[model samples]
Target chain A: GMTFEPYPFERLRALLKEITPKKRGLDLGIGEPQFETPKFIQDALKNHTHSLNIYPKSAFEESLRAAQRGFFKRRFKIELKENELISTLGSREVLFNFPSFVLFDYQNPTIAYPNPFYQIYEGAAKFIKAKSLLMPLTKENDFTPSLNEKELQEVDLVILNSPNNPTGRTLSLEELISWVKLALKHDFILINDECYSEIYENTPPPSLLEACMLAGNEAFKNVLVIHSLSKRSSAPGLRSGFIAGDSRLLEKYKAFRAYLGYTSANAIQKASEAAWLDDRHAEFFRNIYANNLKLARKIFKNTLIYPYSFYVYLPVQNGENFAKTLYQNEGIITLPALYLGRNRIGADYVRLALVYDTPLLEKPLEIIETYREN
Target chain B: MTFEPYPFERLRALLKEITPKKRGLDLGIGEPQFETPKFIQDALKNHTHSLNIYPKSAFEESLRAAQRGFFKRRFKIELKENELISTLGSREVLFNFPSFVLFDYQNPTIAYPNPFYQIYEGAAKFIKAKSLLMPLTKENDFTPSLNEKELQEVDLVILNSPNNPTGRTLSLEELISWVKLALKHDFILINDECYSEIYENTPPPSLLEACMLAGNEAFKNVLVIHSLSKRSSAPGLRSGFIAGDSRLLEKYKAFRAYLGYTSANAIQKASEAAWLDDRHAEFFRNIYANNLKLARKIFKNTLIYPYSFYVYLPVQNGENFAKTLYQNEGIITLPALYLGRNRIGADYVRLALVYDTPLLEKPLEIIETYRENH
Candidate 1:
């Protein structure tokens, strides 16, 4: 049997058989949150227990769509029509499948993406049979890549991530504008993955949809935005999100979705509606991260490190060696950045997550400190 | 701008625009449960409210494997971990995409009984380049015509109906035996559909999986039987049901589903859970024969109607009279044989009563009397 082993999943499977027998380790590794799911989620599940039998259908009715539209408004501060926006199982699955639905043949599509980013972009590109151009996000540019003289013409799509994973870099509005200008000029699609749009404290960036709308175009042009509540609400497991923009593209995807059979479970949708209804939980969740960032900053201050995302990309002589040492000696586990990057050079940094509560996270910080002192 | 319209959706769009302005009738319909969804559906939604939040992935995991377990225990008289199946939204989605997975080559395949279930045959043939519905009945021992000695060289697949949309006729053991022989001889895969398993008083017939098990070799040849909802339970929204035998085929399909992104969402899974857990609904539904037989006899006694489905067949001279009757009479209806995309000779009437809940007796009688008197 040809076992389809994707890298992270394969590594996790192999390591768990050996690791689980040992004492509990601090997990600075997985991007998953260690926080409790929201109370409203459980409450929503209790409330909708009876109607679990009815199907939620292709186009969620007016109420769900309106709530979805509200998410766009609250996040981007722009009013989008109901038809222009739609829900997804989560941004991950949508990211995985969107290319199959939206790939246009008007040009030989090349998907420009950051090197060593989310695996789904590669999967999406392969699925659509588009050429993937891995744009390097260099340290010189504050970890942001510029599309300036770097080939933008004749591209069908570009997958852009803000508050990007690993690098935790946010593209400034000026940098975003350059891409917007190129899109308008070339008529290519900008699949902006804004799943992490709400994570920052001082200056979380605005959405590409917002940027496009401010550029005097209907936000629903050749631009598409995927948003999720997984990160913002500590409801990662709930898998709630939506894709909005390009009415014709949205309709085509919806038809393909109907045949492919994707829909948010009603309970998840209801809980998502609740989660998005209030920003209280999201703000509190961000505060949790802000505290952790402050703690991680102080812990790594003497060393060459800064906290930018729920994950901190830490440089070591060899990330795999450092991860093994931290895990074996200090009972601390972190994912080596080599997992994300293509080249051997990027293997020197390990991606450590700051997803646990401040109280629980203190031990991992202490462990890292003790290990470093030795 | 040509909006790519789905076949049925285009009809639905036309129906919606036509329904209000003029008196509209349909005879080309067979939507079970004429009434809106069961009141319990709302209650179930209310009860399983926690299901709304991003589903606990485990909840779906347990429910899906459980569906497979329940199915195996019911059909095979044994439990094999690999035999069960699940899908998103509807089997139609699975049917649409199976072509990408199941076909090894582009050669055409066989289906059974004209005006049969369209999705399966269409999925098998088009997705793999194998197409055609092979006829079957007790006259030929209900073994498919595609199984003839000369034609036995071709893959022979059969559709077994204990009682289908045509006229609730069930395929028996005698039929299954001959079907098994053809399957074994040609090495043609067998797809036994007990899609309508719930409505009958007698136990639905098992396919050759039971007898084929005697020779490990016979059962080994990819034999698949699909059990679905709609007819069995009032809710057709349920996807993924019990199937028997055909491990190799099942696993391959499951693998394809993993990539196709067609697993049922948590709400749909929970609904299937609630649907599968209860037999009371099926028990009460058995009482439907009273209304069914009454409507069938009303059409028979009143007209020189050659054939009858739950709906009134067109007794008028022209093929289009059924649609005319529905339009002039203000009765909602469906055409059975006529107006379908493909057909042999158009000479059958299909009435749909399971949709209406006011009880089919008086309403159908009045329609028969009016049409006859006119």
Candidate 2:
């Protein structure tokens, strides 16, 4: 159909099909948790399994909504109005459908997102046949998006992701505030993919809602934020998350969402409620990634470690070849950077997911460091 | 909002000021009232530990096998890999599939049964496509009549058999004729068979069966979406699949990758068990059949649809009757006007048999008293 390219993982599999591994296989290619779901959350999931017979209502479950509202108040200090938030399946489903929901009336809508971004941003833009204006995330710009209003004024949606996927770069509170101001001035919707916000270091990453409130746009006019339990509680299978802020748009988007009908199941709702209510489990999971990062830093002293996400984007001679070499020599699967970006953005770079524990991570690290020496 | 409020929302507004004498009982929702059997719940609990893995579009072999077994047992239809793909549920596919099909065409038109599930209308509006509403009138046996002249510009047609609100099942000949019509008019046809499994006695034939009888074994330009929400009373599982037409699916599966609306892996495993077994489904169907007979005993004046769980009672005015029921007897029901467009459903009220026996006996008698007074 020529609609879009194959997903990066599919391409990686094709690249590694002919390569033979010299040692035990270690997979860190997909951004999935290697740990078990927490006991409390799993217990909550089991309790509501009995509720599966009932249809999930269009109103969604209020208890789930209240739990997410509690999350916003306790975690970010942003009070969510009733219409300001709605539960969805996860970040992926919302991200795909949100642009179409907002761009319904525009004849020639344009969507802008960071280059080297989540492929869904590009796919969503293509779905609407909207013009895509890539907000380039270059080394020159320190991997943070630099908005061009001349281009942005024509855009309908700007999707910003941080503690970003490949780059691991997050914008500051003031930086987010400035973007919210730009959205208000230009009359475009700004959505920050705060999926990684909960899995940060000592200081948590600020949300777009916090930025909006501090900027005195308490109504959250054209700014929205998405957060999931995937990175936080490591419960992607629950398919639970919340989209908050910009009630003006959410009122309409909620109606749009009702039509989309991806309501979180009660089991999912209660488990997510359990997860959102407790920050300790999220903190515990964060430390696992932290230990892996600490080990990675010791093993490869010269390698760059991003501040927030459990990922490292290394500048290599060539990303594809480097990924192939890792697979062939060490049996470690990693994503090549070229697949993440466009216009030659990720050339000569490779991204590694440091999701495993310190002990298991050492073999790949040792091989990577030794290969570089050769 | 340009889109219509869900019938439930409109029902809320209709009775917001009303207070009733007796205890409140709602017979309005399509949710199943029976217990989700022990086996399905046990399957979900067994997989709760593996919630960290993201759902796959590739559809791990177990779910594929289960759904494959489901099609065989239910309809004697064999399926291929490209012909079937899992969805979060029917709604997301119903909302998103129109755009996937008509994205390349400008000013495309869509036709669907009027007074139908709102998502068909919702998708047409969101895509900014022209909609040709095919009225489901009593004059037409509560099924939409094909108007070839009116459908000339249409790019898609959504047909719901075991049609909601009315539970009208289109005949096998009608399905075959529609298959011919789709081929003749060069448009895609989708059968929303979410209610197919809940028939009173006879198993409703599917569009896939129609395709086979038409000698179109490869299944071009046809699709059907089925849900476990109604079949196995596992709406909380949020699992379903779209089947038929590889050409369309080849394109849709690729587009859906960008959409990321995949069901969680644990949910998929649980769904595998639900889909493979047919005993629980027939057991629940018998319960609904039992309730339908009970409804017939009390409401002799109203006509009952053979399949599914609804009683579409003819009223002088639906909104007035529904309000009066809530006001006087504490009974909740939906006005068909909310489900339909252009005053099509203005003279009917839809009640569901989602609750077990005796709970609704009082409400049914109360409605019968109102019927007697009328």
Candidate 3:
């Protein structure tokens, strides 16, 4: 009987079971952006509706892969070969399955990922029956896994998330290089989740591929990275994303994905090609997040603020209590940080996703401001 | 390193290496070649805007209820909400990691058709379960045999009816016998009914229909997987469902949510349209039936199975015949031997009745010409 801890929203529903909001509340608890998808992408999908009659082979459409390559070259300045990349339904599916594919032969595997992590990481670890090292992401280590030699050697896989969810932490190029070096020395697979890589305020984030190249691990040995359109293009329903880095890993993973019958539909692939080729839409999205971030900062006042991403981790006495109060009185929804952490590490914090526009944020921000004053 | 040799990749390289002289006529893949219905395409178009909205895998009451309505109308059996669950496609669910659940026994085994869909074997291998091949050969009337000794060790048994390549179907009595075997042996029975709706003559009987006839009211340990791929001529839609025992489904659904195997909203809407309306599917089925009649006219001397959308003709040497036919006439068809456990059986080629009317004629003529020359 496989099991996962209930999703945060499930727990949130149980918490707000008896409460009714004073007004129609904004659902900032979800990470999905409240924006209409670009019309051209939808039209592209409509145009290929007839392709639905054909079975999609495990291989991706050439145009879609080329679009991905084009985007990579333009944004990260990193060239990818055909074999070096594979499109996934989304980062979630890849994250859940990649570890199992990589570690299938190990007798007893161990996986290490940042605590206050994505739930799918935990789900994958459980599915494979791997021992998990919950590397704490506290203020001390700044939301990244700080690994010693013993920890590195024990780990068969390591996951890093930069411009991370819940906590808006970005890793520098030097820091990424160190991790890549460590992976090379330890002979372990290292994957950076760059799903939020396209969403930033000022400084563009460095990718793990860049770090691998800089560290002279040109083959991208024991390294991979995954990115998605869910957050970047505000089209979570597209379920389109890609993994790129080690060609060896990509080849094996791609075969495993094929065995799993995992391939985006031809119509979705066409739309994804349109989405990936166009940079203007994501740039437009970044501005929305940037404006929302500004509003968050002004509302939170002198609280801690991470310079990138769409999240603010506000300190609170009891996260569940604060969420309940916010929903009950102020008609605002938020995710309690405890859902993302183990033990009580995040027990005293609530995470807010600035996914709504400034006008929509006005009432929720003011509600938070009132709570802060009291 | 885990490895499964892809049959399609093997076919691709083999055909490409020897340049065919004429324009290739591909009778190899089982992709439906009929044009997608305009109404379904329009429905997809109407829902393209939903691509911006994040999907909830657990809820989609409209889609689920629509699917239930479809099952009720088709099978003449009522299904409770808990008894059925929707998937991206039957393939995705078939290849998912939850197959490991039944493999938890001390020395577990799984059984499926020998000339089969590859996903069953892949799933067994991923879970480290021993495979018991249920050979489907002409001598046995293309039906899997019942083995008392092997059945004891088997934890999971997969049955494909109106089967791919072979195109054989089990009668209602035969399906009832299987339900009794499952109950007696205390093992999970899953019947792949993906091609059930695409039958030529009378409608195929489902395992669920047989389950009710066997007086198993609760449908304990019985399940069936159905897909819209063949029936609706919409493989890219990637929509399907699993219906059976409520208890087993609840467990499977919980794990599936963790695996992130949800269909996109736009695809779901299109599927809802296809499932709710029977006219398009009937029209699609008639086209397959028409194509089969055309094949019969050309290949009258060969033995063609009557139920599903394939003609599995006997060949002296499957691999050699496939190569020689392709090289001499540029007509491509699949070898069924490799699918039957390494040349132990099915030394034949499978021709799909999937191509449109005119294109199909050329391939059959080429095959006949090659036969005459040889």
True contacts recovered per prediction: 0.14, 0.83, 0.71
| Interface RMSD after interface superposition, model 2 | 1.8
Give the TM-score ranking, best first: 3, 2, 1
Estimate the TM-score of every prediction: 0.81, 0.94, 0.96
For residues A190-267, could you state the per-residue lDDT of candidate 3 as single tens digits?
999899898887778889899988999878889999988888887888888889989988887777777776665799
User: Relative to the unseen true structure, what is the Cα RMSD of model 3?
Assistant: 2.0
lDDT of 2 by residue, B177-230 (tens): 989888888889999998888877788899889999998789889999988887
Residue A6's C-alpha lDDT in candidate 2?
A: 79
Q: Model 2, stretches more than 4 Å misplaced?
A: none
| RMSD to the hidden true structure, all candidates | 5.2, 2.3, 2.0
Q: What lDDT score goes with residue B177 in model 2?
A: 91
Q: Which tens-of-lDDT digit does each residue in A25-118 have in candidate 2?
A: 6787777778888899988888888877777866578888898899889998877988999887788878877887788677899888988988
Give the TM-score comparing model 1 with the true structure, all chains together.
0.81
Candidate 3 per-residue lDDT over residues B302-353, each given as its tens digit? 7665678898877676677789988867778888865668564446888888
The numbered model that scores best in DockQ is: 3
